[PDB]
Amino acid sequence: ADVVTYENKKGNVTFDHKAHAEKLGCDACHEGTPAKIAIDKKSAHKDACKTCHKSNNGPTKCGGCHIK
Numbered sequence: 001a002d003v004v005t006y007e008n009k010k011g012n013v014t015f016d017h018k019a020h021a022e023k024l025g026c027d028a029c030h031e032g033t034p035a036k037i038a039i040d041k042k043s044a045h046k047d048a049c050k051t052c053h054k055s056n057n058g059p060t061k062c063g064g065c066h067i068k
């Protein structure tokens with residue numbers, strides 16, 4: 001999908017898949033044929049999400065991802 005929401009206790013995270021793709025291109029996150037990427041607390045706080053944000057305006061602070 002173009003937008004993915006990860007409902008959770010700390011506050012729902014909205015992942016705008018389309019927006020990220022437009023700015024980075026598919027191979028920024030997908031190796032080979034684009035397929036689903038398992039997202040959980042551990043991956044999100046590391047290489048699947050947070051790590052890349054450390055180089056841009058991307059959110060690294062808790063509230064930048066977790067809203068309410």
Ligand code: HEC
Pocket residue numbers: 001004017020021022024025026027028029030034035036037038039048
């Ligand atoms: C990192 C910021 C990404 C970029 C850039 C693109 N994709 Fe992605 N994609 C990413 C994640 C974290 C996930 C999992 C989302 C979830 O369901 O939790 C995905 C998933 C896909 C899928 C899987 C099938 C589906 O149900 O959508 C496809 C087919 C996919 N991504 C395609 C794709 C293409 C072609 C991209 C360039 C336009 C692209 N992605 C960029 C993360 C990232």
Ligand code: HEC
Pocket residue numbers: 013014015016019020023024028029039044047048049050052053056057058059064065
């Ligand atoms: C680089 C390879 C990235 C990965 C992996 C993820 N994100 Fe990202 N994110 C990236 C950029 C370049 C930006 C900055 C946008 C800009 O133009 O300044 C962002 C931004 C976000 C945001 C902030 C609000 C928004 O503009 O959408 C959120 C909430 C966000 N990213 C979430 C997010 C999640 C949950 C990811 C893993 C599924 C993820 N990002 C990966 C670059 C990269």
Ligand code: HEC
Pocket residue numbers: 006007008009010013039040041044045049050053059060061062063064065066
């Ligand atoms: C965006 C790059 C994030 C930042 C920065 C932080 N978190 Fe996060 N967190 C993010 C996602 C996409 C997820 C996965 C949700 C899922 O579907 O499983 C999480 C999850 C958590 C959780 C677990 C919530 C639960 O109900 O189990 C916690 C407790 C959590 N995150 C805490 C947290 C804190 C305090 C942060 C600052 C250090 C933080 N997160 C940043 C994405 C992102």
